[model samples]
Target: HHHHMLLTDTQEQIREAARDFAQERLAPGAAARDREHAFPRAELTEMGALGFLGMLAPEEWGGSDLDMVAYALALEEIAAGDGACSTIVSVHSSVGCMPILRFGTEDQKRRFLPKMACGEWIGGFALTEPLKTRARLDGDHYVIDGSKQFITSGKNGNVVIVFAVTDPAAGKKGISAFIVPTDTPGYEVMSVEHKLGQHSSDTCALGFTNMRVPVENRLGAEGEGYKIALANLEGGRIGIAAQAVGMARAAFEAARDYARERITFGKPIIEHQAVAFRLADMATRIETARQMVLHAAALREAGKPCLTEASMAKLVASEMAEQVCSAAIQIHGGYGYLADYPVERIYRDVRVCQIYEGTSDVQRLVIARGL
Candidate 1:
């Protein structure tokens, strides 16, 4: 019933498959994983086998090579099942492999893509820093020293796309990106943060003490890190928007079901005008957010400029997700406040949607600049 008429048959099939996986596999253990802060390693492997990991990679590199629209649809279903799992998937697919697919040499793609596609290697992106991480060029390599914070999959991933300051004087233009293997001698996971939500995914602080990366591992050009980071973020925003829509949908459905079954006064709560109105508004917001996300994805798939659209989608969807999750909690009254119900977890999970990928404020800035 939520299916859009514009989706191709293949897109619908991809969405359905992702929905089945989410409902049957990811949903069952989501609560436990969240409570235990357990990473979804096995689920990720399963997803990789299903080609979810390589939705945007080329088929010659063992990727599915699916369009952006299909990728967004699949991610939404995955997020609906488990927000934490979806975070891992979104980071891996959007930031982890995408830069390589777009900018890597043929050898780089050949070496990394197949293993990454099959889940033999999990990908990570490490861009957030206080300019602490410095990469100085030596004879044949770049010696990186310093740290990164709030890196998703920083501890468990096999490889990371690390951005470092290559020239202290050049400001943003001096930053550069590299494909660093996690097993390298100087690369270390210093600490994993205990976050307010998405406990099932690892967000780590990483330290690099003279981390040596071969010259060939540099992604794009030396001064192109800022450009690459910004470019990738457009697509990343779309992925995050899809994730927000999924979380909103899940919370809305849970609240609706609860309202229908719970009797208040003399009748079901759904018969109450206030409750009915809240559901209607939540549904409307979700539908609108979803369309915006799909529109951004369609633009990206067609190789069109979508910077403003992606930001709008992310800004609206993430904020809407927060409001919808809060309302779902309100609908359940005290029950929603407890861990016994999923709404509390949903509420916590949706909060970061407004914070990560890009903050709601940042999205607004991007939109304003575009206008």
Candidate 2:
């Protein structure tokens, strides 16, 4: 870590643990998992058992009681070994568990947080509803009908924090949030996509046909869905930024080390001004991204409004990761283009960082609005 002295003892300890777990467990099978596109249920549970899934949750629920900065550091370390492993915990902690901790009633928290904290039950968030899926209040129950795609952890999810339009005419104000169990009748994980990278983490298309949820399951009041979703996304963006930092660093370090041994013109390629400058540029950019991530996390931990900063961090860090990873491959020459090289995998994994959580375009829109 660039700012090692900035981290408190607890934060450094968590980062160390995560780093050890990632290198020892995740790195060993990362390539095979990506090659086979296999779901990493076993490792995921191991993370949960280690209390990675509930870093921000209150200690009463068996969470780590860590703050946003600590969470970001832990994620960065884990992502250094495997991006998919980092994605799994980040989504679970940020969108899935944080929402309930922030807005759910005492009963809802009691019922959900315990299992989620211990990782006995996986959690997800469903916000991208299909055209046909909608929700209507019927007596004491809310009947939900719709499908969602690209839902992370959906295949093994026990519960999802779902958003739907409760009143179509009210526009954004009509939207509401719900705690929907995946085992509910008509709720199904349709299929998982074979993606460019992060294959160990399962992303699924979900279907909820006439699914019924009790009104008590609603998170916050009606018309608060958009607000709730935006709140959680800010935190999610910080996690994504940290993941990007780790991904970029992984590529940069590999390229730097490789350049030292690779011979060109009867000397190490790193001796050349062109390749040396590229390594310097990669290091500088990664450090910049790390600082941005830390700044946003600091604001979030302080309970301040960080929408603009969070988006800025995500936008810059993700784009930086993509650029750095590409430059790394260029440094490796032909070997980097081959599957045999780890830089190739880093290149693919970093691409998704720009597209997910929020697209770079979407992040720019948010920043422009803030200005």
Candidate 3:
């Protein structure tokens, strides 16, 4: 009857819809995509049609206009099916769409949101390298010259929210955000990373050599880039937290099923106290993490200041995912390490949850500062 006590009837429906799509469409092809380093273009388009891509945007702009809780719930389902695909969706929805919707001029929104909402145009965010990318005013255009590394969807996306230094002396205040079309003449995808996991999602090194973007493309005020970037990351942390919960749940299910079927000593392995206790701990951790993620989303939905809460959610969930995935692998014994099992892939995919969207260390710093 209910997934979470806090979930409303509408939120439950949204979650079930995403669950059906993920289980039916994404779960089957996830391993193959990871093996081939393929992008989920068709699946993404389907998600767009379902309004998953624009979950947070206003319905007037072809978005779902859903609350953050619904978005998180849907994201968890998607992540459970395929962590790689979830990464693309999370980055695009949280960092990619929110910034434009929140800070862009009306004309900018009119020009971009419709296409993005429908998934015709994939979105990318680039803010990691502030010093490397510099945008200087040249008459009516900003001439951008710099490189961005480890950019999600850099090669596959149609447009990117790029951050660059507009003034050398202003430090963080000098940074500015721009909506850069990936097809711009000087924009180039230098290389895609051969990553340890999430191989299905492209992480690219992007280059801009005198890339000229009109002044109208800027997302916010000239010196407002840092604020926008931080705001985006705060929301992104919640997305990552949800992603961790989904990934952990997948691994836990696999391990639980495997334990019940696999015999050890005399009976099913799950009968053993050690194995059973591991499952208990795994389940408990996952529930706790999921609650944290939901709580953070609820705060965000209420328009409350949730920076510390978001950081806490991300930190706990990501770390819990690693632990739960590791336990899942242990429960599966040697089978978990092999490519044949989904647990191995989920294990690999969940690692980045700790490192990206602000690392675990950075999260601690934020929480400590808040305290």
Candidate 4:
């Protein structure tokens, strides 16, 4: 919500709708889903039916036609309830849909957008190939033959957006983007990724073995893929920032409530300066990071480029989540790290925030470029 009458009535509707859905669906089962590494296909299917999947797609194509800010609000609400579920939704909506919608040919959009936006097709974005893998091209149809080690929705995806080099001789210019179905002949789902936090969101490794993709499937013009990817990545950064704020707040709010109730030294923990001060700092920083998301979203909505705002917001939000969640764990002491406490999961979820959607290091580069 804008501080000074920024959002119109319609935008408020979007916020309310997303908040309602998240509370009703995601909040109830977050803990269970996290433990099981299960994807809530049923809840997501409901979202598909409501057109949440295609919130940014054009109206003619049965997409929601909402602006990025509205989408940000929806993301924030779901993230507030279940961060892993929201993360999955963000990648599919922001990172996966952006390039195709922005650069795909009309025919391409016609074919893919409808299915994607409506949830009939779940999408994946594959980049960050195995840290030390090689990318190559061959003939009229580019062949993707290597492994992307950390693909979100990799194993269960019905649709995926893949990035590889078509002109390796040209280096970065050689990179190209392709939209491919999971069932492609040479594409193999190696296995699901198992790790801390957001496993509820589902990440995995995918191997491409002579994965033949028609040249037409390539996004944008030759050599332009990297530019598109980077620009779109900027947008993804904004979404992730909002997600970080949600996760951090979930932890911080719980800790704050605990401090007020759990008396120590014959007084509430909040009466102790040590505990109170740390909680105060966390609260302030969370507010700062959230305002930063609003600022970046406004810039994006106005049609101005927000690379700097996006990076700054993302950088601070990620760091803030780390500090806030750490303090939250400290407040709860051993219980914070215990699986029974939601703070433990929130702590781990916040860790991955620093590492993905462009690492904190990558964000520094994005910010430095403006300087």
Candidate 5:
């Protein structure tokens, strides 16, 4: 029995439901989708129907009325089956919908949150203005002209949250947020790229060509986009931390089973001190990262700011997952190196965890600023 101190009865129920759903829905498609780089729209729809998509949105505003921890547990279970589905849901729920819930006008909530919550609409976050295409804002409307890469759920989403700089001269101070519809005349999904893992989730390059958004759509205020995005990132980090743990758990179990069943030197691998020590190290790191995620989640649920702990949790957990998955592959020897085996896929999938949300370098800055 694995015990997590922070999970309540309700949270546990949600977690179990999510686990069943993922095992039944996401897991079956995960391998083929990863190999084909296909986005699983059908799975997204199913998860959304179960209210996994709106687990954190407020009830009055058409959300499930669940707490952050509920969302976290559900995400962990989902990622346990398929990392890409977990990633997509996190971006949609936290980054795509949170801004509107917190900062949007009452009308904005009525227009977007309700359908998004009910799974009628899919949403995406679009904040990565590629360093290559520099863009800034105009006067009343922010005239966004640039590109965002690796936007999860970008392909089939109906709504997207976009950020642009209103005043480049002011640097970070100049940035602003915008909620743009995907059907907006000038907006385009330029390319969908294949990734090592999470390929079932579409990651696209979004181009904004003089797309004009009303000043009202800006989340918070003129100078608030950076803060909003940063705040959202903290939440997003904890979700990814949970995600990494789930993926590592899958890989670890696979390796453990093989070690017990396979014979080496006329004995099971688990009987070897070297193999046992490797498994022990992975379990230790995973437990530590899981605790960090719990601490961060508890703080956020209590209405405390969790920037430092969140970054630390995400940084260490994601990195540890990469290590654990790699070690798992090594334990399986040549069998692990082949694509026919899932651990090989898990190894590549874990690599992308280190790069997204905020790179390890970006996390260092986030951590240093706190210290």
Candidate 6:
């Protein structure tokens, strides 16, 4: 039996509920969705209705009044069934809603959080850019221009957390944050990427050509966008780490079951020294990664500094998922290479864990900076 002494009974219940949903809904057509590159609109809507989308929001805002630990546990279950669906949940919750919770005025929260928490409005985060996206103050509004790349839900979200350079001369310090409604004129999702995996979750380039946002929509003071981005990235990293754990667990479960049943050389593969060793390593790494994730979440829940811990968790768990999933493929031998077996999909799904939120290199940089 798996024992997480740190998790409360309520947290465990949340995890179990998410797992049941994953197995029943997300898992059934996960492969087909991935193959079709279909956005998980229905799954997200169901999750929203169930309150998974509002785990971190305040209860007053239709949120579940849960902590970061609960969010992490629930996300792991979602990822286990379908990586793409989990990505949507994490990107929307951790990065999208977090900013509003932490920095938004009461009015801002009142306006957005309720709808966002209930999933009546899907949220998105937009921060990545090639230094082209600009948001300039103009009277009572900020006129934003340029484009954002690799944005999750950039194409289909109801609201987006957008950041752009307000001071062209100031570099990172010139950046500012805004809550922009997708219905705003002059904003468009130009193109969605055909990625290596997680196709069911949309990733698109967002274009803001003279997009005007009210002054009230600014998340914090001018020049605070960098700080907001960094802080939110820390929380988002924890979410991604949990996601990595789920992917690794999924691959591990599939591989372990196959090893016990598949016979080779007149015995079950588990009887072989090499296969047994691989399974042992996989289990050890996964448990270690989960602990790292939980530790980071605990820190965040306690309102403690978790910058370094979050980065470490994200870095280790993501890389571990890649290795474990690859080994899972190896364990299944020829069968794992085919789409008929889910390991093939698991193998592809885990790859993006390293690249999104922050790359392994970027995580290392953050860790070093903390030191």
Best by lDDT: 3
- Candidate 1, 1-371: lDDT as tens digits: 55655888888899999999999999999999999999989998898899888887888998898899999999899999999888888888889999998889999998898999877788999999647688999989999998998899999889899999998899989989999999988999999899888899999999999899999999989988887777687779999999999999999998988888773544755579899899999999999999999999999999899989999999999999999999999999989999988989988998999998988899999899999
Which candidate would rank higher by TM-score, 3 or 4?
A: 3
lDDT digits (tens) for residues 1-371 of candidate 2: 45643878888898899889888988888899889887677887888888888797889988988888899999998889998878888888899998898899999999999899888777889887543456899999999988899998888778898888888888888888999888889788889888888887888999888899999999999988988887787889999999999999989988987888773544755569899888999999999999999899999999898989999999999999999999999999989999998999989987999998999999999899989
* Cα lDDT of model 6 by residue, 1-371, tens digit: 44655677888899999999999989998999989999888888898899999988888899997888888999999999999888888888887888988999999999999999988788898888746788888999999998989999887788999988888788888888899998999889889989888888889988989899999999998888888887677678999999999999999999888888773544666568899899999999999999999999999989899989999999999999999999999999999998988988988988999998899999999899999
lDDT of 5 at 1: 53
TM-score of each: 0.95, 0.93, 0.96, 0.90, 0.90, 0.94
Give the local distance difference test score of model 5. Answer: 0.81
Q: Output the lDDT of residue 19, model 4.
A: 83
The digit string of per-residue lDDT tens for model 3 on 102-199 reads 99999999999899987888899987752769999999999999999889999999989999999989998899999998999899999999988999
- In candidate 5, how many Å is residue 101 off? 0.5
Model 5: lDDT of residue 112: 87
- Candidate 4: segments with Cα more than 4 A from true spot: 1-7, 131-141, 260-277
- What shift in Å separates residue 318 of candidate 1 from its native position after superposition? 0.4
- Measured with C-alpha atoms, the lDDT of residue 168 in candidate 1 is 81
Where in model 3 is the C-alpha error above 4 Å? 1-5, 264-270
Off by over 4 Å in 6: 1-5, 264-269
Clashing pairs in 5: none
Residue range 199-284, candidate 5, lDDT tens digits = 67788999888787766666777767777776687779989888998888888888877777773554656578898889888888
List the candidate 2 regions with Cα displacement exceeding 4 Å. Answer: 1-5, 130-132, 264-270
Alpha-carbon local distance difference test for all models = 0.90, 0.87, 0.91, 0.81, 0.81, 0.89
By TM-score, highest first, what's the ranking? 3, 1, 6, 2, 5, 4
TM-score of 4: 0.90
